[PDB]
Symmetry: D2
C-alpha cells in the first residue's frame, strides 16, 4: 500500500516531460468535465470476462470438429463467426453466445479508477455490463446506449455508449457487432450511434484504454480522424498497456497519426502477464495527479492555489464557507 504510493511518487518524478504534459492535460480535462474514456476489451479481460478468441475457438470446433492448428489472424476473428452464422444456424450462434456470455463477473479496480476520473461520457466496444455495474455502484448514472432507439430517448446528458451493442435485450447476435457482416454493415446499421461517438470524440478529450495500437476500432477511428481538417481537433490520448515498451518508430508513427500515447511499459517495470499492474500504474498516475499527491515543492503550491483563487479576484469578498467549495 504505502510502498506503492512512494513508488508512484518516484515514477512521476522521473517521468518524461511529454508524459507529464499528457497527464496534466488529462487531469485538466477531467476537472473541466470534458474527459471521456474509450474503454476496450483489455479492461473487461481484467475482470476475467470471456475473450472473443474463446468464442472463435468454439465456433471453429462446431464448424469442423477440431480446434485450429495455428493462430487466428485478424480476419479469422470475424470470418469464422460469419461462417458459423451462414453454414450453421442463427439459433446455434445465439445459443453459443448465450452460454459463453451469460455469466456474472465483478468490476475490476480499473473500472473504479475510470469512474473516479469523472468521465463526462464512457464509450466502449465491450458488450458486457461491467461498466454499467460500476457506474450504478459508484452513484453516477449513465444513459446506456447500445441500440439505435436508445439515442433518441436518452435520459441524462451523459452516456455509456456501447458502439458494438450489448446483451441487455437478449444474448442474441443481432444485438451485437461480432461477425464480419456486422462490421461491414456497421455504418448502415448504426448511423446514430456512430454519429454520437464521432461527436463525443470531436467535442471532448478522449483517452483510449484497453486497446492495442493495432486494434481495428482504433485504426478505424484514426482513418476517420485523417479526414478532419488539420489542427481542428484535439489529439486523443492512448493508454498503452502492452508488456513491452513501445518502439520509437511505432510511437512516432501513431503520434503523427493523431494519438498521444502514454505507454505503461515505459513508465514502470512489470511482468509480461502483469496487465493489471500496468493499467493501475497509468490510472493511478492520473488519479494521484488529480489528488495532488505529486506536488513536491514550493512555487507549485503557489500555482495550484493561484489557479483556484485568481478567478475570485474579480469578487470583492468571498465567504469562508465559499472557500471550502473553492478547494473542493
Amino acid at each position: 500500500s504505502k510502498r506503492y504510493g512512494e513508488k508512484l511518487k518516484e515514477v512521476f518524478l522521473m517521468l518524461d516531460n511529454n508524459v507529464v504534459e499528457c497527464i496534466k492535460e488529462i487531469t485538466e480535462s477531467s476537472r473541466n468535465g470534458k474527459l471521456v474514456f474509450f474503454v476496450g476489451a483489455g479492461v473487461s479481460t481484467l475482470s476475467d470476462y470471456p475473450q472473443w478468441w474463446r468464442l472463435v475457438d468454439k465456433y471453429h470446433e462446431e464448424l469442423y470438429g477440431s480446434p485450429k492448428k495455428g493462430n487466428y489472424s485478424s480476419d479469422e476473428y470475424l470470418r469464422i463467426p460469419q461462417i458459423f452464422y451462414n453454414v450453421k444456424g442463427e439459433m446455434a450462434f445465439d445459443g453459443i453466445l448465450k452460454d459463453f456470455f451469460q455469466v456474472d463477473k465483478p468490476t475490476n479496480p480499473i473500472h473504479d479508477k475510470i469512474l473516479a476520473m469523472n468521465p463526462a461520457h464512457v464509450i466502449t466496444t465491450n458488450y458486457d455490463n461491467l461498466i454499467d455495474t460500476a457506474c450504478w455502484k459508484r452513484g453516477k448514472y449513465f444513459s446506456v446506449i447500445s441500440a439505435e432507439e436508445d439515442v433518441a430517448n436518452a435520459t441524462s446528458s451523459r452516456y455509456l455508449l456501447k458502439v458494438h451493442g450489448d446483451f441487455r435485450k437478449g444474448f442474441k447476435g443481432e444485438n451485437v457487432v461480432l461477425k464480419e457482416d456486422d462490421y461491414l454493415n456497421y455504418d448502415q446499421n448504426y448511423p446514430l450511434i456512430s454519429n454520437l461517438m464521432k461527436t463525443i470524440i470531436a467535442t471532448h478529450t478522449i483517452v483510449f484504454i484497453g486497446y492495442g495500437l493495432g486494434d481495428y476500432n482504433i485504426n478505424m477511428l484514426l482513418n476517420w480522424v485523417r479526414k478532419l481538417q488539420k489542427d481542428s481537433f484535439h489529439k486523443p490520448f492512448f493508454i498503452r498497456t502492452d508488456p513491452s515498451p513501445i518502439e520509437n518508430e511505432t510511437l512516432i508513427y501513431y503520434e503523427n497519426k493523431g494519438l498521444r500515447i502514454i505507454d505503461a511499459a515505459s513508465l514502470i517495470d512489470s511482468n509480461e502477464y502483469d496487465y493489471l499492474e500496468r493499467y493501475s500504474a497509468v490510472m493511478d498516475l492520473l488519479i494521484e495527479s488529480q489528488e495532488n499527491k505529486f506536488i513536491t515543492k514550493d512555487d507549485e503550491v503557489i500555482d495550484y492555489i493561484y489557479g483556484k483563487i485568481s478567478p475570485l479576484f474579480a469578487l470583492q469578498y468571498i465567504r469562508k464557507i465559499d472557500l471550502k467549495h473553492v478547494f473542493e
Copy 2:
C-alpha cells in the same frame, strides 16, 4: 385549432420545458430583417460575367452555378468583393428572433451566414457557443451551440468562410465533417423545429435524405413551421409527413395577405410561446390525466408532505 396542431404544440412546449428543443433557422427569418437575399447576389454575379440580368427565372441549380461560374472565371477576389459590398450591412433583429430565443432552445442550428441570431442572443443576454468553422467544434466554450452549418463572415467577407457556390455544397461533407456530424447528432438527440424554410429547400431535403437512412422509429420526427402564403396541399402534407416531418402550417392557422410573412411567422411563434403556460385542459378526463401524471410517481412514497405538494404542481 386542429387536434394534430395542438399535439405538435404540446410536444414542442414540453421539449422547450425539458431543455431539449432546438430551432433550425432558415433564410426566411433573416429576410424578415430585410437581409440581402441570395438571388440578389446571383443577380449581381449574372450582371457581372454575362453583362445583363437573366431574362427568365433562376432555377434551383442556377443559384449555385452562377456564383460558381463567377468564381471560376472572375476569381476569388471579385467574388469576395461582391460578397463584402452586398453583405457588409447592419440589419436589425426581427421579433421572430426574440420569439425563437424566448422558447429557450437548447441549441440553434442555422443555415444563415449573417450575425442576426448572434445579435439577438447578445441582446437577450443568451450566451451561445457560436460554431461556424471546423476549429470551433473542439474549441466550443459551452454545451449550447449556435451552429452555423454554412459558416459566416465573422472571420471575414470571403467565400472560403461560407457555403454559397455549388462547389461548397458538393464538398460540404468533406469540408465540414465535424460540423455536419454535430448537426446530425443534435438532430438525433433533440426535438427539432424548422423555421424559415420552404419545404423544398436543399437543406431540408438533404436532412430528409439522411433521415430515410435511419432505423425505423429510432428518431423523433422534426417539426416544420411552414409560413407560405397559400395553405399546404393535402398531398404535399401527406408526402412530407411520411418523409418524417411534422408540419405546422401558418396559412392553415390564420388568414393573412400573400406578403404578410411577418404575421404568419408571428402567429406560430406566439402560439408556441403563449402555450408554454398553457396546459391544454378543457374536459374532465384531461384534468384526471394531468393530475395523475403529476402524482403517480409519488405513489412509490408512503407519505408526502403537504408543503411539498406546491412543488409538485409548480
Copy 3:
C-alpha cells in the same frame, strides 16, 4: 472557327477505328415528338392537385412530383399514366440515322424509348441493348446500346425506368453494373453528347465524376449544344474547364428559335460529310 475544326477531326478520327460513342439525350427523342417528361409531370401534378401547375417547374419538381404521386397514389396508378402516355408509336427523326451513320462503337442513352432500337434494327447494325441489371452479363455482342435509365420492353412500369426522385437517389445501388459499364465506356472512348443541355442533371453528374478522375487521364467529351441562343463566352470556358469540348450549333449556323431539327442536323451531317 479554328477550334471547331479539330473537334470534327477528332470525332471523325475516333469514328474510323470504331472508337466513337454517342451519348443520346431527350432532345433527340423530342425531335420525333416523343412525349416529353414535363407533360408527364403535368399529368401527375393534375391528378395530385386537380389543377395545372400555373407556373414554372423547377428541376426538383420534375423528380419530386412523380415521387409524390407514386407515394400517395400508388404504383398501379403511376404505371397507368406511364402506360397511356408512353405506349405510342413514334417515327425516327433523321438525327437517329445520322448518329448511326457515324458507326459509333456504343450508344449510351438516358431515353427509355425504343427510338434508337428501331433505328438500329432498320439499319441492320445489331447492338446489344442493355437497360436492366440482368442484361449486363448476358450480352451477346460487344457493341452496346446502353439505356442507363431503363426502358419499357419488360413493361410500362415505373420500376423498369428511372423517373422519380427515389430512382435518381438510389441509382447507384439499383444500377451498379449499368453505371459501371457507362463509366468504362466513357473512359476508354470518345464521347459525343447530343440531346442534352449544359444544365442537364445527367451532364453535370458525369461532370462531377470527371473531376474525381486524375487530370489528363481521360479524353474530354464532346458536347453538341443545340440551344437556340448562342453560347456565352463565360459559360463556354467554364464548361470547357470542366472537361467538355462544346460544339455549339447556334454559333455554327443561323436559324430560328423553334427549329431544332436542323440545329442537330447542322452538326450531325457536318460530322458525316467529313467522314
Copy 4:
C-alpha cells in the same frame, strides 16, 4: 466440379474468358513475395525481424510505418533492391495464356505475365496507371490493378502500403471501374489466390452489392495443400465463388505447388 470445367471451356471458345491472376502464380516463378519485403522494412525499422507471423494488417502497416518515418526515397530504394530482378515464367503462365483469355487481370506488379504474353506473340494492352486506360490501343487488356514498375521502381506506381489500399478508389477510379466492368461482362477464373485474400474479399463485398443472378459467378482455383473443409465450401459458394480444388482432385505433397496448379490448368486445356 465437372460442370465447372464445362463452363470454362464454353466461355473460352466464345472468347469471354478472363483470368484473375494473383501472387501465387508469381510466387510459383520464384518472384520475391511481399512478406520478405515486409521483413526488410521491419528489419530497417526496429533493427531485427519480428518473431511472430505477420498479420494481414502488418503486411500493410509496416510498409506504411516505414514510408512515414523513413521517407519515400528509402521506401523506393528497398523496392529496387528486391524487385529489380529477372525471373523465369513458370509453365502455368503458359497454361493461363493457352486458354486464350479475353483479358488478364493481375494484382501482380511484375512483368512475368507481360513477358509471358510477349513470348507467345499475343498483344495485350498493358494498363497499370490511370493514363493507360484512355491510351489503350486494343480491346483486350492486361489490367494490372495494383500498378507495376514499368514507369520505375517507385512506391507511387504500385499499391503496396496501407495508404494505397485505403485511397485505392480515389487514386484508381478508372482502373477499378475497368476491373469491375470486365468481371461483369466476362466469366472470371481466379488463379494464384487464397480464399482469405484481401482482394478476393474486396470483390466478394462488391459482388454482394449486385442484385441476385445479375452476374456470372466467378470461378476460383484453390491450390492450398489441405483439401477445402466442407463447411468452408458452402460459405464461399454462396458468397458467389464456384471453387475448384487441386487438393481434392489429386493427392499432393504439402510444398508441391506446381503440380496442384498444373493439375487443374492442364485439366482445363485437355477439356478444350
